[PDB]
User: What shape does this take?
Amino acid sequence: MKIAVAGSGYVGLSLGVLLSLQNEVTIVDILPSKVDKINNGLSPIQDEYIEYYLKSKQLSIKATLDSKAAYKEAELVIIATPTNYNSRINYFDTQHVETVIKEVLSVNSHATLIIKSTIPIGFITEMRQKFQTDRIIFSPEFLRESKALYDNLYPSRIIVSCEENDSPKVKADAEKFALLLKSAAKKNNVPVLIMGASEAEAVKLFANTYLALRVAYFNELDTYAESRKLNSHMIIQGISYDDRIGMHYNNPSFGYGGYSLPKDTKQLLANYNNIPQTLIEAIVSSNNVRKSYIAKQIINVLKEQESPVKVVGVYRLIMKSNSDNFRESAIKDVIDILKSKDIKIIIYEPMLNKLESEDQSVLVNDLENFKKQANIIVTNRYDNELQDVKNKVYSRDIFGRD
Amino acid sequence: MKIAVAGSGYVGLSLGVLLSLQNEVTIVDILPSKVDKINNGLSPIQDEYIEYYLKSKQLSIKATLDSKAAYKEAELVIIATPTNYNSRINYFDTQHVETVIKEVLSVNSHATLIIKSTIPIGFITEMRQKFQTDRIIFSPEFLRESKALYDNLYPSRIIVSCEENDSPKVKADAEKFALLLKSAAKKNNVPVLIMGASEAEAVKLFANTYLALRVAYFNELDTYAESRKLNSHMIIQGISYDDRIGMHYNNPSFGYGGYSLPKDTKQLLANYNNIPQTLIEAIVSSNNVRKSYIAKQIINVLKEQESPVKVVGVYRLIMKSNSDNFRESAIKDVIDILKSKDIKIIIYEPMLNKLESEDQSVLVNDLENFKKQANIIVTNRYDNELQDVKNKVYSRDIFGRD
Ligand SMILES: NC(=O)C1=CN([C@@H]2O[C@H](COP(=O)(O)OP(=O)(O)OC[C@H]3O[C@@H](n4cnc5c(N)ncnc54)[C@H](O)[C@@H]3O)[C@@H](O)[C@H]2O)C=CC1
Ligand SMILES: NC(=O)C1=CN([C@@H]2O[C@H](COP(=O)(O)OP(=O)(O)OC[C@H]3O[C@@H](n4cnc5c(N)ncnc54)[C@H](O)[C@@H]3O)[C@@H](O)[C@H]2O)C=CC1
Ligand SMILES: O=C(O)[C@H]1O[C@H](OP(=O)(O)OP(=O)(O)OC[C@H]2O[C@@H](n3ccc(=O)[nH]c3=O)[C@H](O)[C@@H]2O)[C@H](O)[C@@H](O)[C@@H]1O
Ligand SMILES: O=C(O)[C@H]1O[C@H](OP(=O)(O)OP(=O)(O)OC[C@H]2O[C@@H](n3ccc(=O)[nH]c3=O)[C@H](O)[C@@H]2O)[C@H](O)[C@@H](O)[C@@H]1O
Assistant: This one.
């Protein structure tokens, strides 16, 4: 089948390559760099499986900047563009998704549009009324960065929306798409759920909010443990042996980061409007409180030192273990708070070439010089190459993952 | 070994019977009824395994009101008395545990005292200083009511506290006790953790608080679902397929109830004092908000009816599925809120013989009359015997469990 995918990020590229094994895929983007990379078998992001598929699999995939040409030819269009949370409007800025819907509808009268980008609850319904069509459905995406294609090869589940009174074509396409994902998976028993759009939009926001809830909870337990001089690993291990709690996704950090959890928890809170709740709002505030607590602990360690200048060395800015980006990295907010103090900040981050011109932080990518200059080394996740300066490293990492 | 157990409740009786297979157990209580029942092979509470063991196993177990005689003879004393949360003092009322420690210490100079009752973080340390001894340790209890003995036959884990500078005897007893629990289990691979008292006290409060967090979260998702006319089962099923979230302990209700979750979440919040957090306090408030929301939904359904008198029929007061008690049952708080309105309340609850004299609610244990009189039937968990009046039943139960 001829499929067009809007957006070549983690989601777009993962799905485009997944679907390119037995379908004719065209990935659309507005960045020439990504288009040329893809057209030459190169992945714009670090991902073991995407890199492997582009390099060694028979794929029917190409990229283009020509939006209209790609969408006109498509039988199905998958939308995977950004959906940033905008603090000014207290909501997701859905312009990049809407602009694609408009473009697709203006040149294609038969294709069903499938949104993979995380969206507000009620968005499909709002878009269907705005554009006066039923050819728009949602299929949430659950992949994790660094396992973008892997998670669609071995998905937890597949969900696609369909409304009772949708046209036979849209209903058939919703089903066909769910089955294209199922058949492309290498995993044998993948649950497939077909539900209303609002239910599906809710699934995605409530699932990510639960993951943020869990990180936030283990981080508050960790705040307590550090404040009371208790062994955090012993306590976490003790509660995690209850299989209703579990030994996964329970490693303390400076806060939940990444492009997704921060913005999605905020979006869910907004969708609640005045519906009664107290936990949803606390999951968002808990991250802020955790970050401020971490900043104060660092500040207190520093004032216990006798040095003319106090220098904090930040070891890495990656948003989680094995990440290739710093989107909403928790340590960056901690840094912001430390900056309001008389503290010099140096950053060790190989993936970065230069800091923005106004940044007062100083990038020191020679590890040895970095260790020498830092009075204290702050890092979200520990790494063995810090072994020789271990006694001046501050981190709440316990399990070395996530 | 000669073991004395203080308290014949779910915890005390479960452990006393468990340990009575290969040890000489004496259970102590202040209620003559419980002592006579136990001495005659009868369980004071409903529990399939305890009833089976008392009736068909070779047990070395007896009960007595004679506290001092039991404690003087003991080699180990297990304390399983109440630890209620007291709203006036903003803390657990630990008098029943302290009174037992005092009694044991006054007549026994060698036995180590093991607390199974859930206690405040820092309590062992406080008690050790108050009584000036190190012969007091904590071993949290994780059993569920209705599976009291079953959960100790198949425990998730075993935890016993020990401090680095405790006497060789207390350290040896801490270990021996952990191994008495391990060897008495029928489960083969049970993790055994030895940790500091404060860490162990924290494990118990943080584990129960996570279970309350989970119930509170799925209940807030349910509030949202009902408010927006969405299918709650579809949404919950959709997020639960993520194995990091899970298909367990996720059934909506009128709130988390039982003697334990309500009081333990409140106790943890108190132990936090001013340590930074926002989630811990929200887990407690979320229950209140959920209950008030449920009461309003019922009130709204009622005002849509044209009857001279509006009657709400409450189907059962049990605190959870298969429970034999109503401790902190969520529906009771909902009832309290409905009472401030012009609503007649009738209750169907076979396990109850009479309501307190001042109660304006009326107990109607003839099911047929109950169904006839109720304009709307409210219940925490559905039951098939309500099939014929299904259209007037209000419940948020989805999965028929917990
Ligand atoms: N990153 C992840 O792990 C997951 C992200 N999501 C959601 O999927 C959406 C995309 O996320 P990512 O893939 O991480 O984003 P990304 O930022 O990595 O990639 C977005 C791409 O879309 C391109 N783009 C912007 N406007 C476009 C337009 N008008 N037409 C065509 N291309 C356009 C951008 O140039 C960029 O290459 C977001 O809503 C995100 O919340 C969902 C699951 C996982
Ligand atoms: N019920 C449960 O599922 C679990 C309860 N726990 C904790 O264990 C403790 C006990 O809970 P339950 O067993 O449910 O209580 P319960 O209320 O069922 O039983 C307590 C028993 O102790 C007796 N008692 C009171 N003072 C006594 C004294 N001074 N000397 C001797 N006996 C005395 C009472 O008469 C009563 O029979 C509480 O701290 C509870 O939080 C821990 C795990 C599970
Ligand atoms: O919607 C999305 O975009 C995706 O967001 C997350 O995936 P991802 O953002 O790649 O990252 P996670 O591995 O979930 O971690 C998120 C943040 O929480 C933090 N975290 C996670 C787990 C943990 O134990 N501790 C912890 O601090 C991580 O360091 C990271 O900053 C979800 O796991 C995906 O299912 C979802 O599809
Ligand atoms: O400390 C205790 O005393 C015990 O408390 C709970 O056991 P229990 O109180 O018997 O009851 P649960 O089955 O945990 O249920 C607690 C409350 O949450 C509610 N709940 C639970 C699960 C769920 O999916 N939905 C839900 O509403 C139940 O209806 C009930 O009112 C814990 O499960 C035990 O591990 C712990 O040892």
Remarks:
- The longest strand of chain B covers residues 2-6.
- The longest helix of chain B spans residues 197-227.
- The pocket of uridine-5'-diphosphate-glucuronic acid (ligand 4) is lined by residues B 118, 141-145, 208, 211, 215, 249-251, 253, 256-258, 260-261, 319-320, 402 (CB under 6 Å).
